[PDB]
């Protein structure tokens, strides 16, 4: 009921966004370079989404990933089930990586089995959001440097290579089960293969905590500020000399066995994920759709606005409520920090994307229906109509199908899993929540 | 469905946990130190919990917060509803902080209403969990230091103390409302007071710059703490030149409005929250009860998850028996999470640092579970007061606070967006 005390202070906080949107833009002159929508071209297509569910038992998070591709062709599904012990943040970011990795895989594999003159793939989110901020950020990058420093710079390279090789083999081996059954219960590689790898590259070098050194930059800053006292302490130097030493400097550090064993796992899972973005970018027409992303850190690397916001701008200013599309003038590039130098050479389609960038456009499929954020590898002009063959209505069918189908209104493992973990040995952890 | 290889993989992963626990490092000689519950003592008590609902509109989070106290007096309650601009971590983390802010207040005020020879508060969580990894962090620290550098030390401490004051009149106003109606709709201060404090200490120190940015002169003075972007900017120069320009206060920064604003907001919330712990820390018998807790840190920082040990026993010693087991050595908090220029202001936290947190595993009845029990004082003292209220499998004031806070089916579900429908814009309200 009430809370009404707040309300205006909500409404304001809302509107004080928009009344600052129609100001700063000065309409940004762009809304009028808006181009109503092109003429449908016939394509064969697959839309895909995935959904995860998680539950905790004590220290342990238990999750079931599901990913689904619907389209011009049969229904294809990747699913995975696992448990991993919990860091409150780091965990979720791991699950979501795997989730994302399942999509990337499903996406590309789906491309390969799509026959046609005009072949396209639709995704449930933004291409940007993935590569601008890597999930598990203050873990993944830290973990790779932790690994590289662990086993050495070259030993690492082989590890990367061995693992990719395992991965290439993986996709082919997956590719089979999608033919026969059109589903797979093990889309994810890193988990099963992690133990083996460890004892090869790791278990030799390790001796029972231990000493690595990496740069101060493999984590921070946060802050983000610096003591005054240092400028005095280091002086008679040039700001340039200092910044060198600053950004450069090696900090030391100590590592237990699990710490190592985790860094390994992270490194891999990170590598796997990457390898699916690469092997995904290979898709000729790659289509990313999202009803809502948010613009923060994006207008940073330039200025743009959330769809929902925009949607209102046009309908309360230029009056439209009208169907069509608006491209953004700037093919936008990626940041290279999310991609360690020693990584990219393995995934060139990523490397490619940094040089070429993404093309973004807002879109409205109908009337008093709403505005979506389109991103694509190729150009909006080219990619857009392809998508358009499939519009059902307020929007496209196959996306609508993927969204709806992979929806879990019923968790299998709800009754199922734990009730069989009563069985094997111990029903107590099962007790729990 | 299931792979049953995945199931094996799952069972597997879990069992290693137990056996590696049954490796009995500190466990071997720990378990037989298991004591039987003491006798109950008469105590007046308020168990408190809180729940939160959130929903997204584009890049804007809507959240509704509730806290509830049930116990040896009538039912006290807090609620707050609001919106923030979404940053995946930061938003969801600032809710969380606010949530703990009510639960803490509510716990502090509930105490002050208490009648008994022994008075106690019962909280739904762990003491350690919040303060070994504070909510919204490292973000909450960088932001402080941002302002400390930005608005400068003196006018900062000026800001600190003022805000603190406003917070005192806040609590009193709250206690009042609590009395009469037993409820309050504005438990949270910062959101209402931020924009006012922005004009004072922020807008003062800044001039408009270009698109969405501002030009900020850096003051001078106790760390002086220049923002890192000041070395960034000064690149062609000698360090001596830099200080001289710092001395004469030529130096300006080009950083963005919103970042600063947000940094401010983050700062206040974080203080309104620290006030919240410092107050709740005035409670003389304060207990926290969590069935499961954990973290990768919860071993290393100087010992095990309840459910593992719960299992280990019936599967070793055969007890499955009621009782408790007190972890021997009190735990102090890691001091990094609590800025030194802050605790000066919050004694009890500062005090909590020195004295530390007593922890014990407690099984209230029979083959029921093992809750984690944490307190500002000795388990031996507190546990008796708790036990006075043992309901059943576990304590009533709490199971009430639980069931009672669950009391939200989504209110704003039909409601809020429908009256946002009104004012002018339904557009975002369209979930679009
Ligand atoms: N795990 C994770 N990392 C980064 N950004 C995320 C994540 N999950 C959701 N998002 C946000 C960021 C973008 O707006 C979009 C990316 O969708 P996607 O299809 O997942 O590429 O969704
Ligand atoms: Mn999705
Ligand atoms: Mn709770």
């Amino acid at each position: 009921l009430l809370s009404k005390q707040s309300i205006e202070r909500i409404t304001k906080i809302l509107l004080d966004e928009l009344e600052n949107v129609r100001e700063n833009e000065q309409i940004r002159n762009i809304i009028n370079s808006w181009k109503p929508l092109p003429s449908p071209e016939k394509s064969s297509i697959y839309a895909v989404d995935g959904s995860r569910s998680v539950s905790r038992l004590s220290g342990t998070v238990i999750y079931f990933l599901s990913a689904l591709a619907v389209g011009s062709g049969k229904q294809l599904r990747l699913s995975y089930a696992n448990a991993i012990k919990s860091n409150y943040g780091t965990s979720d970011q791991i699950v979501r990586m795997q989730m994302e990795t399942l999509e990337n895989m499903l996406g590309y594999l789906a491309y390969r089995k799509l026959e046609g003159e005009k072949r396209a793939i639709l995704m449930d989110g933004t291409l940007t959001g993935s590569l601008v901020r890597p999930p598990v950020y203050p873990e993944d990058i830290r973990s790779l440097n932790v690994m590289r420093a662990l086993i050495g710079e070259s030993d690492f390279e082989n590890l990367l290579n061995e693992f990719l090789e395992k991965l290439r083999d993986h996709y082919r081996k997956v590719e089979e089960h999608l033919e026969k059954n059109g589903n797979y219960d093990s889309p994810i590689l890193t988990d099963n293969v992690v133990e083996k790898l460890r004892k090869k590259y790791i278990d030799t070098k390790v001796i029972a905590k231990v000493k690595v050194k990496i740069p101060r930059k493999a984590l921070g800053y946060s802050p983000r500020v610096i003591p005054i006292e240092v400028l005095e302490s280091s002086r008679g130097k040039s700001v340039d000399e200092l910044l060198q030493e600053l950004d450069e400097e090696k900090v030391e550090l100590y590592l237990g066995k699990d710490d190592i064993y985790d860094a390994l796992h992270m490194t891999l899972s990170y590598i796997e994920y990457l390898y699916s973005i690469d092997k995904l970018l290979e898709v000729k027409n790659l289509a990313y759709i999202a009803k809502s992303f948010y613009t923060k850190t994006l207008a940073r690397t330039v200025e743009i606005v959330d769809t929902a916001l925009l949607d209102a701008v046009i309908r309360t200013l230029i009056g439209h409520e009208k169907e069509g599309y608006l491209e953004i003038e700037h093919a936008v590039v990626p940041p290279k920090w999310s991609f360690p130098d020693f990584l990219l050479s393995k995934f060139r389609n990523i490397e490619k994307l940094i040089d070429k960038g993404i093309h973004l456009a807002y879109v409205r499929f109908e009337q008093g229906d709403v505005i979506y954020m389109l991103q694509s590898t190729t150009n909006i002009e080219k990619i857009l109509p392809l998508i358009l063959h499939h519009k059902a209505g307020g929007y496209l069918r196959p996306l609508q199908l993927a969204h709806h189908g992979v929806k879990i209104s019923y968790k299998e493992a709800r009754h199922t899993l734990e009730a069989l973990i009563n069985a094997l040995r111990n029903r107590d952890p099962a007790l729990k929540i």
Side-chain angles (χ1 to χ4, degrees), chain A residues 42-208 210-271:
Chain A
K42 187 270 161 217
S43 53
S44 39
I45 216 148
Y46 268 126
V48 15
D49 209 338
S51 75
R52 58 194 212 275
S53 153
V54 300
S55 63
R56 326 186 96 80
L57 293 189
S58 301
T60 322
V61 177
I62 277 113
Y63 57 111
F64 189 67
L65 300 173
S66 198
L68 178 61
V70 34
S72 32
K74 48 156 165 184
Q75 259 188 36
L76 300 211
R77 227 178 259 256
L78 306 187
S79 79
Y80 193 52
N82 197 44
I84 157 64
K85 59 221 182 32
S86 190
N87 325 124
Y88 249 100
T90 299
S91 304
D92 306 346
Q93 282 164 317
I94 295 153
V95 175
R96 195 153 27 212
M97 190 168 261
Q98 289 182 355
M99 176 54 75
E100 281 217 16
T101 309
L102 273 241
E103 312 205 341
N104 292 321
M105 268 170 18
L106 195 57
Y108 147 85
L109 314 177
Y111 191 61
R112 308 234 277 182
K113 257 28 170 201
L114 199 71
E115 161 187 341
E117 203 202 359
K118 304 314 199 85
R119 298 166 171 122
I121 308 280
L122 211 55
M123 301 282 288
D124 197 50
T126 84
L127 216 167
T128 72
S130 50
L131 95 169
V132 311
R133 297 296 169 153
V136 82
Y137 164 69
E139 190 53 27
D140 57 17
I141 260 77
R142 117 136 112 171
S143 280
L144 267 74
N145 303 127
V146 180
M147 286 305 316
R148 158 185 296 244
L150 198 54
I151 49 176
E153 190 152 295
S154 68
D155 250 329
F156 179 88
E157 185 56 32
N158 304 328
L159 170 49
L160 192 172
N161 295 308
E162 168 154 12
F163 179 66
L164 298 163
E165 235 277 273
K166 293 250 181 295
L167 266 172
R168 164 209 153 95
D169 262 68
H170 180 43
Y171 288 56
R172 165 180 45 215
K173 172 168 298 198
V174 178
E175 206 178 6
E176 294 173 24
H177 298 68
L178 283 312
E179 306 276 28
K180 332 198 267 201
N181 345 138
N183 130 273
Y184 204 6
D185 9 280
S186 170
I188 263 281
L189 185 59
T190 287
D191 291 336
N192 319 329
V193 172
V194 81
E195 196 221 24
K196 205 162 61 75
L197 266 308
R198 164 226 311 197
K199 52 193 310 84
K200 182 175 179 168
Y201 290 94
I202 285 310
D203 286 339
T204 340
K205 189 198 56 49
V206 84
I207 58 289
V210 265
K211 192 86 150 339
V212 260
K213 61 182 178 299
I214 61 179
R216 94 139 285 106
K217 277 344 187 121
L219 251 78
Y221 223 145
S222 298
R224 285 311 191 292
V225 310
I226 162 194
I228 236 281
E229 289 77 18
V230 246
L231 273 60
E232 300 102 83
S233 81
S234 273
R235 193 219 285 253
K237 321 185 191 181
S238 83
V239 185
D240 301 290
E241 276 163 327
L242 180 40
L243 279 131
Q244 175 219 350
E245 313 180 5
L246 268 181
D247 133 279
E248 205 157 70
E249 149 242 56
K250 240 124 127 62
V251 330
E252 325 200 29
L253 186 176
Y254 305 106
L255 290 176
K257 253 211 204 53
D258 59 320
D259 293 302
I260 291 184
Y261 294 1
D262 295 297
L264 211 342
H265 183 269
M266 176 68 29
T267 302
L268 303 184
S269 321
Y270 188 51
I271 285 181

